[PDB]
Each structure stands twice: as C-alpha cells, then as structure tokens.
Amino acid sequence: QEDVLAKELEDVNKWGLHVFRIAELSGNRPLTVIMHTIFQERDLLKTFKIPVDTLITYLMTLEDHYHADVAYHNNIHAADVVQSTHVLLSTPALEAVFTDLEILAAIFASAIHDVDHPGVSNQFLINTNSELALMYNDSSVLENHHLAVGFKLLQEENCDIFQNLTKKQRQSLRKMVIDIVLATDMSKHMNLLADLKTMVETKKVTSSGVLLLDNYSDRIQVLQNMVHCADLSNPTKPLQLYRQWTDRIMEEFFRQGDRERERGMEISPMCDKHNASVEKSQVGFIDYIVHPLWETWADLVHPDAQDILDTLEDNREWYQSTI
Template identity: 65%
Template sequence: MATSGKRGTAVRIHRIADITQEPREIHTPIVAYKDMPIVSLEAAAEPLVPLLPAIQSYVAAAKSLCKNPPADGLTLDESASIMLYSMGWTPEDQCLYIALNATLRSEDREKLMPWLSYLKLLLTALQQLPSERGTVFRGIKSDLRNEYRKDSTIVWWAFSSSTTSIGVLNEELFLGKEGKRTMFAIKCSSGKDIQKHSYFPSENEILLHAATQFKVVDSLDQGDGLYIIQLQEIESIHPLLQPLLESNSDNGSKDQPVHTVTSPISELGVDTPHLEELRCLLNCINDWDLDIFRIEDLSCQQPLTIIAYRIFQERSLVRTYAIEPHTLISYLVALEHRYQPVPYHNRTHAADVCQSMHVLLNAPALDGVFTDLEIMSAIFASAIHDVDHPGVTNPFLINTKNDLALTYNDDSVLENHHLAVAFKLLQADERNIFSHLTTKQMKTLRKIVIDMVLATDMSKHMQLLADLKTMIETKKDTGNDIIMLESYDDRVQVLQSMIHCADLSNPTKPLKICMKWTDRSMEEFWRQGDKERDFELEISPMCDRRLASVEKHQIAFIEFIVHPLWETWADLLYPDVNNILETLEQNRDWYQARLSAPASVSAGTNITNSSSPSSSPTPMTKTVSSSNEEDSLMK
C-alpha cells in the first residue's frame, strides 16, 4: 500500500525537491478540465487505470484514511482526492502525483485527457482550502542559479510541494549543510495548506497550484555552497491554469471570479515582453497577409485576445458602446482559454478568422453598408465561431453518440455548442461587454451572431453559395458596381457569406502562413482518423494518415469549395478582392504542379519546408463523412 517510514520520507523529499524536471518553455494553458462534471473519486480514477493499474486500490485506501466528515467543509471525495495525491507507491512512474505532474509538464495537452475528471475534483477541493499568503520554501541539492536569472519570469507547470519551515530543508534528509544546494524562498499568495487532508498529517505541506507563474526577485550566494533564489508569485490576468468560476461546495467559500481584470490594462491588451515588435506587427492589422503565427509567438500564445482587442479599439467599438477595457479583456481572456489545444481549430485559427473578417469589412464596396452594431456583431461572431472545438467533425460526434450530438439533436452540433459557450461567458458581470446595449440592440446582435456562426457549418456551403450568386444577380447595380442592400436580411446574408470566406481563407494567404495551416489542418484530420480506427468506425476521407495525399486534398478543396466561393465573393465586391483570388489560383496551380512532379509528397510528409512561389493549405472542414472526396468536403 502507500509508503511510510523511510520510503514515506523519500516521497516527501521527492515532492519538495522535484524542481529540475520543470520545462523552461511556455505551453498552452490548461483549461479542458473546467467543464468536466464533478464525480466520485472512483469514477475520476477510472480513466487512469490503463496508466496507473493499482490506482483503485489506493483510492479505496485514501477514502478510508480520510476523516469523516472531512475538515474545511470538503466532501469525502474531495478530501480523498488530496489524500490520494499525497500518497506515494511503486513503481514510481505509476504513482499518481509523479505521473500527473509529468503530464502537466508535457507540451502535449492531449495527454491530459484521462486526467481531467481527477483534476477537476482535486482543484475543486483545493479551491475551498484557505490560501497561504507568505513565504514558503523548496530546495534541491544542486546549483540552479543559471536557470533562474534575476528579473526573469518562470512557470512551474506541475503542482509544487513546499514547506513553511526552513528548518525542514536544513535537515540532512533534505538539503543538509554541505555541497551545492539551492533553496527557493517563495512569496506566494495562493498556496494551499493540505495538512488536514494529507497522508502525512504531521508535515506542514503547502501545495502551489500547477502552472503558477513567478518572478525571480533575487539570487543570493550565502556561502558554503548554499544559494537562495527568491521568487514572487505573479497573479496574472492571463492564468495558465484557468481557475474555477466559483466553489462547488456548500460552505459558502468563494474565490475571486475567474478572469476579473483589476490590474492596469496593457496598451495591446496582453502582458508580453515583445511589446515593440507586436506594436509594429499590429500596424499591419488591415493587411490580408498579416503573419498570425508571429502574433501567436509574440503574444505568448494569446493571439485572439490581442487581435480582437485591437480591432475593437481600431473600430471605436469600445467608445461607441461604452465597453470598459477591463471588461473586454476579461471576456477575451476567458474566451481564448476556452479554445482547446487542438492542432487547427484553436485560438490562433479564431484570431486569424477575426482579423480576416476585419479586413473583408474594410472593402471599399462595403463602405457605409453596415451599421456599427452589425460590424460589432460580425467581429464578435468571428472571434467566438469555433470556441471549445474538440478537433473532430460533426459526423464523428454523431456517430460516436457524443453528448454534444445528443444535446443538439445532431443539427449543427459544433456550431450550436460554440454559440452556447460564448454567450454563457457573457453571463458574468465582469465579462459582459454588451451590458450597455439596449434590449433591442442585444436581441439584434444575438440574432446576427447566431446566424453567422451557424453559417460556418460546411454542410450549408452549397446553399450559402447558391444564395450568394442569386444576390449578385438581383442586388448589384451593374451600372456603378454599388451593392444594393437596403434590408436587414440582405446585410446578414452578406455577413454570413463573409464569415464563411474568412473561415475558408487559408488557401488565399501567402505561402509562409498557408503551409503552417496545412500541417495543422491535416494533423487534426489524421488524429480524427486515429480515433475512428480506435472506435472501429469507417475512417473519413482524408483522415487516414497512411493513405492521405495532401496535394490531392488541397486541389480538391480549392477547386470544388474554396475557389467557387471566393470567385463569387470577388464578383460581389469587384475589384476589391481580385488580388486574393489571384493568390488562391496561384496556390492551386502550385499544388497541381507539385502533384505532377516525380517526387510528389506522400501522406504524412511535412511539407512546410518546401520552396515555391506561392502555395496554400485548406482549413480543416467540420464535417467529413462521405466516401466521395468532393462530397465529403461539403458535408
């Protein structure tokens, strides 16, 4: 069973000294656990059995060892989740806290999937414990000064055990008094005292949350091989581990609402050390060829927040609709954190579509066509249009009887879910960016946004295209190329087509940008194919990584879907988007030439390093189910 005695001491030493495994890279935030239901500890542990075969035995032990009723108003399952974390067993790689922390440190967020239920239960329990505000200590028998430079910012991605007693670290079993050793003096504000729920109740263990950010305040040489690194916990407005909105207990304990921004707003809406370079890039926000991947990097993985914030400012929507900057940032941060770390349908795709929508709205032919409210609705719709996308298609959700498919009756499953998530985020006062709209304005905005996001369902592509062609024939004054859009319905129809174009804009972008989208979209396809193989389902077209041809898929997608759409859009706005159409056609020709070349790239080959005058990828479509490739692109 769980370790005690010398082995138990080793467990405590390991947790307090478990520092060198922390990666230096910034990973994507940890958010997927948040919408998991709270279940029993046994149910939360069930997905972990393949990883930790003995876990259910330790679950039973943890529940039997907990005080009943537990301290701090926790439920038995909540208290036992902490007890289970504090236990150690062999083999070490199958011990819960070691395996969990290794997974939290990994950049592959998909590895967290089996852990989500347990993580939700553990974080729910920890949230209800009193926070430790003071100095705590960790340490290791090594010199880590080079990795913790003064004034730098670091992240400890794993849960970090610490102690309030500096004397504990001086004991021979921990740091001792000889050799090179580093002691961390950490001024924390959110540490949790788990002593009343720990397997080691005599130890004053303070648990620091996973994905906590720190500033290195100082690095001191105390002599005799002892170095002290002083850290200060950073209470970021962009937390890397999204906190729960509120306590799930009945004891009335409430934490600070998630993403309430009270600190001064940065000029660009996000905290980043790359302010100057970002400022220069954002001067090109009206350009079609803006490098969204550079924005992704320089914004510390917050591209949607920085793009949407800039557009709201650029279009004076903040002033027109009395939107408080803190409220706007709070909403955008919460929204961005709800985008899952999937290869394609992620926050960067949302930022790209939002910026593309902004550029399309600037077309001279559309000058004066839309009201300010319609423009704000369009920008908002583009920002939210894929929020919480799981990286699989509607047919996959339907065929696997996923809860989302059952909730939305198999009808535009993902699109309805995106809308529900986005509007629910507005329910918190601190995130309600539309609080100053009249009831009529809010009703209008909501209808426009719903109509636009539902139009991103690829199964509606053919009807949308046919309606757009009809509009061109009936609404455009061919004598002076003016679009006659007197009615609200006409304007919304154009906005639906516009977001569809923005969503399918990857093949119209420059090579450097497009090829990255190709890699991401195809990887998401292939991951779905892997899942379909696991479910023993028929693998959807282009989702089998062993058989897929990147070139054939790109050519088919451009010829049958993207080019007809953009050709029609170009007719509507002639000559405003002719250059976009030309790039699309060049990209199609490049793929055709590549397919005809003797050494054509085969399935599974990364093609982003290929040289060419111009090329493009396609976005991952939401609904691929037909055995016919052309049909599959439209379903």
C-alpha cells in the same frame, strides 16, 4: 518584445498578417490582442461604451476556452478568422453599408465561431453518439455549441462586453451572431453559395457604386458569407501562411482518423495518415469549395478582391505542381 508585437499589430488591416508570429509574440494570446487592436481601430469601445477591462477579461476567458491542444481549431484560427473578417468588412464596395452594430456582430461572431472545438467533425460526433450530438439532435452540433459557449461566457465576472447596449441592440446583435455562426456549418455551404450567386446575378449598387442592401435577409446573407469566406480563407493567404494551416488541419484530421481506427470505424476522407494525399486534397478543396466561393465573393465586391483571388489561384497552381 512588446515593441515587436506592437509593430506586427500595425498590419491588422492587411491580408496576410503574420498571425502565428503574433500568437508567439503575445504569449499565446493572438485572439485577445488582435480583437483588442481591432476594437480600438474601429472605435468600438467608445461607440458601445465597452469598459476596456471588461473587453480584456472576456477576451482572455473566451481565448481560454479554445483548446490549446487542438492543432487547427484553436485560438490562432479564431484570431485569423476575426482578422480576415475585419479586412473583408473594410472593402470599398461595402463602405457605409453596415451599421456599427452589424460590424460588431460580424466581428464577435468570428471571435466565438469555433470556441471549445474538440478537434473532431460534426459527423464524428454524430457517429460516436457523443453528448454534444445528443444535446443538439445531430443538427449543426458544433456550431450550436460554439454559440452557447460564446454567449455563456459573457455572464462570467466582469465579462459582459455588451453591458451598455440597449435591450433592442442586444436582441438584434444576439440574433445576427446566431445567424452568422450557424452559417459556418459546412453542410450549409452549397445552399449558402447558391444564394450568394443569386445575389451577385441580381446585384444592385448605389449612386456611389457601393453595394445596396434593402433588407435584413440580404444584409445577414452577406455577413454570413463574409464570415464563411474568412473561415475558408487559408488558401487565399500568402503561401507560407497557407502551408502552415494545411499542416495543422492534416494533423487534426489524422488524430480523428486514429480515433476512428481505434474504434473499428471506417476512416473519414483525409483522416487516414496511412493513405493520405495532402496535396490532392487541397487542390480538390479549392476546386470544388474554396474557389467557387471566393470567385463569387470577388464578383460581389468586384474588383476589390482581385488580389485575394489571384493568390488563391497561384496557391492552387503551386499545390497542383507538387503532384
């Protein structure tokens, strides 16, 4: 049974990994085994002198702090965004662009980017005068919390996976990780995409055809959009994967709408299980958000992402056909 899991983990470099199968085969540890597999694959334990027992201890604690009873924003989502970022990092247009530390920051940020998510939106937390929104002054409420939890767990017993980085390395990693996870706030998507478009239009490549990034502002912006694309990568995945992600977000949204009903609040878009249009909402989300984003990413790394974009377009056609 560990033979089969090891077999499935040979796909870790491929888009459309069977992440739900890996979650089952690993005893509901997809985030630990996928992260561990990726750190080995990239030689990160050697490079940053990470004790393997420390890595496993932190990963299992981090994975524990995802809510097993949240339908979408759980440890499987975290594992999938981690793995999708890992693939995006390997794209030919980006070869040798990012340091080992920046690669570690992007992968770590993906792993923690939704930890302790309660299954309700920032807006719900603001409108219900939650303790989280009160702590964070209504501003990137969840994303600040994911960061705070993800860093705090490094301080538990035998959990500091960055114990052997230099002070300058830790300081630089911490800042990049914060910059990246804060960029997953969906209210920042339009400004983030507007900036990605500007970069594509003024794109510079090196003598080898690889993307040329002169400065932190450009490097972090690329990693911010990279993790944001991985976060919004479900509709680009093979359809059997995508449909299960849609089932899960809809279950999670419906539970929030029930709570909104239970309080006499207006029910949020897509949260009313009595007046739902699942297919129309996926087509809408692709047309106004996901495809504009992925088409701009595809341009930045052209033609590396052509197959991903073709799948997205087919999946949109399929959902559209069911209306």
